[PDB]
Amino acid sequence: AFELPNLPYGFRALEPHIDQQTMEIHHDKHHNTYVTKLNAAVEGTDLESKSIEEIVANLDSVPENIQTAVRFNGGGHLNHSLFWELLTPNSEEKGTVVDKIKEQWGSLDAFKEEFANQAAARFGSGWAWLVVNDGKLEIVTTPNQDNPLTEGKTPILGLDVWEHAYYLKYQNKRPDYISAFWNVVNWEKVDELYNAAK
């Protein structure tokens, strides 16, 4: 069965960029619910033995009778599993992907500007992503717990823009949350996701 992964740092470690109370609820409540409901959906079926990456990549072929529960809770589980590892108290803006960003956009600042614009323009619940699409870097957003993996695009950076991810600290000010995010991006994890990209 699927398990709630521990955070790789304390609940306070991303302060003041993300508040401890949000990290605790977002992990212990929101992610845990996705794991509970994912397990209920796949329990005693062949899906129970697969990686969450494989299930979401192959979501469009999951049996119709559970496909929605797997979309929501499988997506939820994968997206938050990625997110916790893509955050760090020791962010360093360097490495393979930062170098590739600088060459494609001209500066990290120009990339951050486009990412912030795409992330702010996601209407309702969802995620902003940096993806590898056919060997090119592309910024896309997805609704609810959808993941670009499902459409053959490998996510290497994600930002949760569900209001639960930012409302306690930022309320309506999603752009201020996006600004604070840059301070805690784990570019080592971004590089790892980019290198593993098929």
| Residues found near Mn ion in the complex (CB under 5 A) | 160, 162, 165
Closest approach of a second copy to the CB of residue 78, in Å: 16
- DSSP β-bridge partners for residue 130: 139, 157
Contact 141, 160 (CB under 8 A): no
Other C-beta atoms lying within 10 Å of the C-beta of residue 23: 20
Residues in the chain: 198
65 binds a second copy (CB under 8 A): no
Q: What 3-state class would DSSP assign to 121?
A: coil
d(CA 186, CA 189): 5
Closest approach of a second copy to the CB of residue 22, in Å: 9
d(CA 112, CA 132): 17
Q: Which does 160 bind (CB under 5 to 8 A by kind): a second copy, Mn ion, none?
A: Mn ion
Give 52 or 132: the residue with its C-beta nearer to a second copy: 52
Q: Which does 105 bind (CB under 5 to 8 A by kind): a second copy, Mn ion, none?
A: none
Site string for a second copy, 126-165 (x = CB under 8 A): x----------------xx-----------------xxx-
Q: What 3-state class would DSSP assign to 155?
A: strand
Considering only residues 26 to 55 of the shown chain, the ones binding a second copy according to CB under 8 A are 29-30, 33
Tokens standing for 108?
């990290």
104 binds a second copy (CB under 8 A): no
125 binds a second copy (CB under 8 A): yes
Q: Which does 91 bind (CB under 5 to 8 A by kind): Mn ion, a second copy, none?
A: none
Closest approach of Mn ion to the CB of residue 162, in Å: 5
d(CA 179, CA 157): 15
Tokens standing for 121?
């323009």
Closest approach of Mn ion to the CB of residue 127, in Å: 8
Residue 169 Cα to chain centre, angstroms: 19
Residues that bind a second copy (CB under 8 A): 21, 25, 29-30, 33, 72, 123-126, 143-144, 162-164, 167-168, 171-172
